[PDB]
């Protein structure tokens, strides 16, 4: 008895028109006239609250943005003025028929002007050289969109492939994206090179920003 | 919130048995990793009616105390598909009268009953269950030291790199909960040695690293380890 939800992602300008639509297979509507459907809204870290009840009700501290419509065979939430808060995954779940299921799931992208990256780099410490690994972290922080380039240059010579990267949930107040890209040595290989750079490539930089340091120094 | 049993790593083919802690119907919902939300299972308040999803019959078990202050879900033969952050959850339901069917002669008397239902409203927070062959680990922490290469203007960044556990999740806090705004904690990445691996970045007025203490607390419940570690300026 699926519950078909569409779209698959969904972005919206903050201020403006946000809606999406669960889709049954069998009917959800009982003779008592209830649509048995409800809305849930889930941020990635964070348990998933509830948002509609009964096709059309909102449940208690969910603002009237919020506003459900549909019958039977057809649903739809939405949300007349985004805010970043609204960056979440949104689930419908049928309640008629057994067994009762969710929804694959509609995410929100909340489109906010273009934001660079700030750009930090961080030494492995002394006390991860002596327990024999050395990590090298960039930090991207607080930009958009989510679209970004993490290169890394040691001694200048250019590495593939040793990195791993690292995303952010949306932001939920002010809707950038932050990113590391770590990279992980041995200490003798660490050891073995002087200069460690993190090449970072973003729309927000008309530039491509390098952020360098010294081994021992 | 209702509070849950803490998170572990369990041996495929073993079974886990995941508490839920405040009278109501109580929901088991699932989410496996790189998917969406899964009904498992549910207990009416009744007592009457246990159920379960397909897949899951044969498998789960809910109990509930004597007190009825702790719901309970068992679940057996454990797989890799059923690595999961597992929610108990309350639930309202209706207990509908569908049709009625009888006769006059006094032997049919049929009258049909189904429960349907209406949502799930107050959430736990949810039990990381791993499925693995692998023995677990705490996670070594190491400084990500703020320098002139993490400052931005008046702004400095610091943090803790969280590295080589196992397995999810660990609870990354700032000095024991006071600071809690401007935090990143990035999603764990499973690095080469099948360990997890990840850092937690504060953002800082600069003019505070002499004045306040950063100090990142680390909680991994499967291995029973806490570490706080002090983050100093280079």
């Known amino acids: 008895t699926v519950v078909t939800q569409s779209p698959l992602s969904l972005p919206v300008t903050p201020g403006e028109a946000a809606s999406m639509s669960c889709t049954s297979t069998?009917?959800?509507?009982?003779?008592?006239?209830?649509?048995?459907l409800a809305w849930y809204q889930h941020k990635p870290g964070q348990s998933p609250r509830l948002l509609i009840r009964?096709?059309?009700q909102r449940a208690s501290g969910v603002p009237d943005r919020f506003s459900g419509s549909g019958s039977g065979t057809h649903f739809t939430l939405k949300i007349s003025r985004v805010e970043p808060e609204d960056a979440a995954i949104y689930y419908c779940?049928?309640?008629?028929?057994?067994?009762?299921?969710f929804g694959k799931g509609t995410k929100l992208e909340i489109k906010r002007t273009v934001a660079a990256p700030s750009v930090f780099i961080f030494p492995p410490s002394d006390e991860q050289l002596k327990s024999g690994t050395a990590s090298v972290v960039c930090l991207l922080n607080n930009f958009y969109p989510r679209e970004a380039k993490v290169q890394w240059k040691v001694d200048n010579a250019l590495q593939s492939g040793n990195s791993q990267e690292s995303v952010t949930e949306q932001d939920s107040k002010d809707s950038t994206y932050s990113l590391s890209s770590t990279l992980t040595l041995s200490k003798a290989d660490y050891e073995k090179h002087k200069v460690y750079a993190c090449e970072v490539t973003h729309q927000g930089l008309s530039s491509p920003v390098t952020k360098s340091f010294n081994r021992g120094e | 919130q209702l509070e849950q049993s803490g998170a572990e790593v369990k041996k495929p083919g073993s079974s886990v048995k995941v508490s839920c802690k405040a009278?109501?119907?109580v929901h088991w919902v699932r989410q496996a990793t790189g998917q969406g939300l899964e009904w498992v299972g549910w207990?009416?308040?009744?007592?009457?009616?246990?159920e379960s999803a397909q897949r899951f019959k044969g498998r789960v078990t809910f109990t509930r105390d004597t007190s009825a202050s702790t719901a309970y879900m068992e679940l057996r033969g454990l797989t890799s598909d059923d690595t999961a952050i597992y929610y108990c959850?309350?639930?309202?339901?209706?207990?509908?009268?569908?049709?009625?069917?009888?006769?006059?002669?006094?032997?049919?008397?049929?009258?049909?009953?189904?429960?349907?239902?209406?949502?799930?409203?107050?959430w736990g927070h949810g039990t990381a269950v791993t499925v693995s062959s692998a023995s677990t680990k705490g996670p070594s922490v190491f400084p990500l030291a703020p320098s002139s290469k993490s400052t931005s203007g008046g702004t400095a960044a610091l943090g803790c790199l969280v590295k080589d556990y196992f397995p999810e999740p660990v609870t990354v806090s700032w000095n024991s909960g006071a600071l809690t705004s401007g935090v990143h904690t990035f999603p764990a990445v499973l690095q080469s040695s099948g360990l997890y691996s990840l850092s937690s970045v504060v953002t800082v007025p600069s003019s505070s690293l002499g004045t306040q203490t950063y100090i990142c607390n680390v909680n991994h419940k499967p291995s029973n380890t806490k570490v706080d570690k002090k983050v100093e300026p280079k």
């Open positions: 207990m009416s308040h009744e007592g009457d009616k246990t």
């Open positions: 009964l096709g059309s």
């Open positions: 009278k109501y119907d």
């Open positions: 959850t309350r639930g309202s339901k209706h207990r509908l009268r569908d049709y009625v069917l009888y006769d006059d002669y006094g032997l049919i008397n049929y009258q049909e009953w189904n429960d349907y239902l209406e949502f799930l409203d107050v």
């Open positions: 779940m049928q309640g008629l028929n057994r067994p009762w299921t």
């Open positions: 069998q009917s959800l509507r009982h003779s008592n006239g209830a649509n048995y």
